[PDB]
Amino acid sequence: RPKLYVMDNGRMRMDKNWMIAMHNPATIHNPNAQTEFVEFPIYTVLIDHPEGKILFDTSCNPNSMGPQGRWAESTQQMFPWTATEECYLHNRLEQLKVRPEDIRYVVASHLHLNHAGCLEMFTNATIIVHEDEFNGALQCYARNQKEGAYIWADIDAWIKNNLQWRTVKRHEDNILLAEGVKVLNFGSGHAWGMLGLHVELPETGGIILASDAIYTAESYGPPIKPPGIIYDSLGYMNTVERIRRIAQETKSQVWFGHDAEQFKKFRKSTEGYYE
Amino acid sequence: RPKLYVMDNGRMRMDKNWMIAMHNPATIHNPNAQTEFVEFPIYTVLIDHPEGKILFDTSCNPNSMGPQGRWAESTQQMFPWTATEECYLHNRLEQLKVRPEDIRYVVASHLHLNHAGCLEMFTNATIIVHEDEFNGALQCYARNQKEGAYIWADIDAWIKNNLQWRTVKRHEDNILLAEGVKVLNFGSGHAWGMLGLHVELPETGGIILASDAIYTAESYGPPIKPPGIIYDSLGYMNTVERIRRIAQETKSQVWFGHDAEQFKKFRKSTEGYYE
Ligand SMILES: [Co+2]
Ligand SMILES: [Co+2]
Ligand SMILES: [Fe+3]
Ligand SMILES: [Fe+3]
């Protein structure tokens, strides 16, 4: 029935402490302990479904980086994005003969700069987003916040391009978007409102797209190693355990948001898909 | 009526990222950004009240550090405590002609190693503690956790010395402990359950003892700069703002848990007291 594509939208580097909070604490013997600037993948997932094309996340906007970049300079320096034109989502989709207009549904895991970058392209889609995440980003916008993980120029484009939103309510149940495609309401954790996907593929089986609910296998453990980027510590911990339970009960794989190792092993859109 | 004493119970050093989460993030230009290893005061407060002597916090145990120390070696290395004999609470109290047996109430802000160290001394007192904090530490003990901020040997002593506990229930209102002395139920934040004191002194006026609900003036802001040592991020943020409001409405000073600058300006027990 359906085909699932992993599209490579480039790499980003940041302080490991953002990814694993307090990963290497200072000691009497190492009072000025150093961190690392680690690299991690940015990716999106296309589910080419007979009921319609579903896109999970949208990576970064092409005009994110550089002197004329939408991203503030501090942001560009703390979370630099490296991507070839081939890695841009529009191009990755073009290489699959998919036009933005062909996307029925976009699922925004959250509205961070490296997941909601290209929402603006999908003007014929219904954008599914957690209401608290939406609200939180709209406040960043309204208060003219220019630094941080919510890109003002990105949100501006969303509104100017008249996107069609479908917010997931705080206590809303999981949404069946299509046969074998369920939107999981993880709620507050890494961000204000986290959404995930459960995909049931005829051949591959079950897949949980966790996005930044779980950064990496190191995050996942056990035991859980929480991130530095976190809004609701408790919601985060609960979400990870919930994902772990869903995986074991549905015998599903868990695809982390930003795990280099796991990504290396993924079959990307230049080699094929998952059925 | 009452006399309030600030007792210097030593100094401790740790990674600044514990105090201020992500205080100096790595950048493209500083990929191996360094943390610092900062010094901060450990103190306790004695309210010599006509209704009875109230102690807020108990510092670290004398036998905490060194090869035969109660603290695990990793803990002694990440959170080293420096203290001369005079800084020990038993001695600080002795210099005020105060015997452990003279304490009617001990208020444990939380049960971290540097606040609950000497609970065992107060065998004739009622130990007031948040129930969630108590529960959390009793689990650390039962699971024989020997690393971390909850010292197994400390907890072992509490049970052996048959301390008399009074737990503050999760949704319990503030407790009037004595005229002008209220226990503030902050709940989860820095740790599982945090208690503060509001003291109304005839001369000095209102004082909020925040303990680790607010590490420092930098934590307090505004804006709030949360710590790396945190269980409930949201509860933490709520608590700080609650303190700000109480302070404003009660025209009260806020005494932070571990603020080097503020502590220097405090009149300690070797110079006098607050009335
Ligand atoms: Co994110
Ligand atoms: Co503490
Ligand atoms: Fe991300
Ligand atoms: Fe402390």
Residue numbers in the entry:
A (entry chain B), B (entry chain A): 9 to 283
What is written in the article reporting this PDB entry?
Asp122 is also conserved and is involved in coordinating the metal cation. To investigate the importance of these residues, we therefore substituted Tyr223 with phenylalanine and Asp122 with asparagine in GcL, eliminating their role in acid catalysis, and kinetically characterized the resulting GcL variants. The alterations in GcL activity may still suggest that this residue is important, but the interpretation of this effect is complicated by the clear role of this residue in metal coordination. This could be seen through crystallization, where multiple conformations were captured: one where both metals are present at high occupancy, exhibiting an active site configuration very similar to that of the wild-type enzyme; and a second form where the active site shows no bound β-metal (or bound with very low occupancy). In the case of the Asp122Asn variant, the Asp mechanism is no longer accessible due to the mutation of Asp122, leaving only the terminal hydroxide or concerted mechanisms as potential options. Curiously, in this variant, the activation free energy for the terminal hydroxide mechanism increases substantially, leaving the concerted mechanism as the only energetically plausible pathway with calculated activation free energies within 3 kcal mol–1 of the experimental data. Visual examination of our EVB trajectories indicates that during our simulations, the substituted N122 side chain interacts with and stabilizes the terminal hydroxide ion at the Michaelis complex, contributing to higher calculated activation free energies through reactant state stabilization.
MLLs degrade N-acyl-L-homoserine lactones (AHLs), molecules that are used in a microbial communication system called quorum sensing (QS) to coordinate a variety of behaviors, including virulence and biofilm formation. We provide the structural and biochemical analysis of the lactonase GcL (WP_017434252.1), isolated from the thermophilic bacteria Parageobacillus caldoxylosilyticus. GcL is a thermostable, highly proficient lactonase with broad substrate specificity (kcat/KM values range between 104 to 106 M–1 s–1) for substrates such as N-butyryl (C4) L-homoserine lactone (HSL) and N-decanoyl (C10)-HSL. The binuclear center, common to all MLLs, is coordinated by five histidine residues and two aspartic acid residues.
